[PDB]
Amino acid sequence: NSIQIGGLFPRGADQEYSAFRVGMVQFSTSEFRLTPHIDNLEVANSFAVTNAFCSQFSRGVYAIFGFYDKKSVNTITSFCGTLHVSFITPSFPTDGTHPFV
Amino acid sequence: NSIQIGGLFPRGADQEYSAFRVGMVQFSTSEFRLTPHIDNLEVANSFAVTNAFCSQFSRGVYAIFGFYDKKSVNTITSFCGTLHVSFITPSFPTDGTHPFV
Amino acid sequence: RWSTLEEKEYPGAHTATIKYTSALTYDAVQVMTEAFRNLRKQRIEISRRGNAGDCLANPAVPWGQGVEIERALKQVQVEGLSGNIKFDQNGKRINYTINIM
Numbered sequence: 277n278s279i280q281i282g283g284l285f286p287r288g289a290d291q292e293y294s295a296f297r298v299g300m301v302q303f304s305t306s307e308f309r310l311t312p313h314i315d316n317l318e319v320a321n322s323f324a325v326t327n328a329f330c331s332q333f334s335r336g337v338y339a340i341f342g343f344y345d346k347k348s349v350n351t352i353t354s355f356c357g358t359l360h361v362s363f364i365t366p367s368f369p370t371d372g373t374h375p376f377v
Numbered sequence: 378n379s380i381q382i383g384g385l386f387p388r389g390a391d392q393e394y395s396a397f398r399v400g401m402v403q404f405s406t407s408e409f410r411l412t413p414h415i416d417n418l419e420v421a422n423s424f425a426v427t428n429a430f431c432s433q434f435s436r437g438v439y440a441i442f443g444f445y446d447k448k449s450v451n452t453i454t455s456f457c458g459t460l461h462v463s464f465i466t467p468s469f470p471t472d473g474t475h476p477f478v
Numbered sequence: 479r480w481s482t483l484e485e486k487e488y489p490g491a492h493t494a495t496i497k498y499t500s501a502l503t504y505d506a507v508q509v510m511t512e513a514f515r516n517l518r519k520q521r522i523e524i525s526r527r528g529n530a531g532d533c534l535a536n537p538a539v540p541w542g543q544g545v546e547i548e549r550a551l552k553q554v555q556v557e558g559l560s561g562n563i564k565f566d567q568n569g570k571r572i573n574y575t576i577n578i579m
């Protein structure tokens with residue numbers, strides 16, 4: 277019943293994380309429940325994003341919810357296209373058709 | 378006193394790699410040389426650059442010479458900014474001030 | 479010497495013109511050789527302690543002698559195919575000359 281998911285949140289994004297916790301309560305059913313793994317990081321540093329994305333991939337997550345900056349967006353899209361990891365994000369749409377986004 | 382160096386060259390960059398091999402011959406010394414590990418890779422794929430950059434760091438290079446695209450440019454700059462690895466490139470200048478480039 | 483090289487060995491090199499991307503590659507090797515040469519001249523060592531390990535090391539461990547390699551590279555001032563070559567504290571070309579034709 278435990279579904280492991282990855283969570284990447286910027287350090288200056290509090291309300292954006294508060295709404296995530298509310299969604300976990302409002303949509304928590306009795307059949308199963310999601311188990312988020314949060315790692316607060318600097319979204320602009322693409323090394324921190326690369327290091328944090330692989331931290332979720334090693335822990336065997338089934339999906340990742342995060343953000344990206346201009347200095348990282350291509351890091352997320354290319355890693356998710358190769359490892360076929362699904363990535364959900366409320367940031368700006370990708371400049372083109374990128375799968376697993 | 379051989380000094381090992383990382384070499385990232387794109388697939389179609391044949392003349393650029395030729396001048397690189399010419400540069401070593403014209404500048405090699407009898408006291409020290411250059412030992413490059415050449416990873417021919419697709420420059421646009423950020424995961425390929427990330428996996429290739431770590432392939433050079435695990436090999437213990439003292440500097441890395443390569444290229445980058447509009448997509449993977451922020452991957453190199455941040456990876457070198459945190460690991461203190463020097464990167465040398467003839468690609469377009471970074472839109473801003475990024476160290477170890 | 480360029481237009482004399484065998485095209486079977488160095489592809490795209492037996493012509494009398496050289497790309498600006500390819501020429502900067504040749505001039506790049508000169509900067510790398512003069513950097514490590516000045517490190518041997520200024521009497522400091524850059525040899526590694528052991529295996530650099532995994533790039534995704536947590537916490538991110540940056541080697542100390544990497545900042546000495548950055549100082550040597552940006553202080554290189556030689557003459558090459560691109561004219562006068564010298565760098566600032568960031569890594570951008572300065573005192574350079576772009577011919578207008």
Ligand SMILES: *[C@@H]1O[C@H](CO)[C@@H](O)[C@H](O)[C@H]1NC(C)=O
Nearest residue numbers: 555557561562563572573574
């Ligand atoms: C700047 O470049 C010019 C042209 O090569 C050169 O004459 C001059 O010496 C350089 N400046 C310094 C401080 O070396």
